[PDB]
């Protein structure tokens, strides 16, 4: 990501230092009244929410480089009380106070457009996932999941495309039975203690709108696997 490198430089030059985080660590949590702006430069994280009955629901996943904001930029109110936990063994991120982000972006229109376009990517992603869901039931959602997974970590091999990731990030009832159905139909197969793609066509078919979203939002990464 060329835009993300320039954003990193522009943040560091204004005295914003990179911060390190380990697995299971939260970059910002539910009850934090201070609103932030996390520039996840590297690493994988998940946005979760704890319900009043103590149950924790995973809502979103994010991968660097990306921008995740905990409040509105002008009024500095909360946009939602959420937690941002780290799922990769290690992650790097810049934590900016919401007012500081307001200032910095008002001092530069290019990075303003950058964060704005990350928000737009989120919106179009949600729309695409919803389309695939409303069409192909709950299969379209998991199909889009596996599709974007293969696109981001796919590596060409004679057997088929493969995702190079530790078993942990891979793992992270009825849905499991649907996985069983797909594995029996052999959409993908497990070998050498790793997941291996077989026919990316099934996922593109049953997760179409997300394939479109990834083609027009990440065309470079989308091209190499097509």
């Amino acid at each position: 990501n060329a835009q993300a490198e320039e954003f990193k430089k522009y943040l560091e030059t204004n005295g914003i230092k990179p911060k390190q985080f380990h697995k299971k660590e939260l970059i910002f949590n539910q009850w934090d009244p201070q609103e932030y702006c996390i520039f996840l430069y590297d690493g994988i994280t998940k946005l979760t929410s704890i319900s009043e009955n103590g149950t924790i629901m995973n809502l979103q996943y994010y991968k660097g480089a990306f921008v995740i904001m905990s409040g509105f930029i002008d009024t500095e109110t909360s946009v939602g009380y959420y937690n941002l936990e780290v799922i990769s063994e290690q992650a790097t991120a810049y934590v900016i106070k919401i007012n500081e982000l307001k200032e910095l972006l008002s001092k530069n229109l290019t990075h303003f457009f950058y964060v704005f376009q990350t928000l737009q990517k989120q919106v179009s992603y949600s729309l695409a996932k919803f389309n695939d869901f409303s069409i192909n039931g709950k299969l379209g959602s998991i199909c889009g999941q596996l599709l974007i997974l293969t696109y981001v970590y796919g590596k060409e091999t004679p057997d088929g495309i493969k995702i190079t990731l530790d078993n942990l990030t891979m793992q992270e009832s009825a849905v499991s039975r649907i996985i069983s159905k797909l594995k029996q139909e052999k959409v993908i197969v497990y070998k050498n203690s790793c997941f291996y793609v077989q026919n990316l066509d099934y996922l593109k078919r049953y997760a179409p709108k997300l394939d479109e979203w990834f083609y027009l939002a990440c065309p470079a990464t989308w091209g190499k696997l097509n």
Partner: peptide, 4 residues
């Protein structure tokens, strides 16, 4: 790079 993006959402997951």
């Amino acid at each position: 790079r993006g959402l997951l």
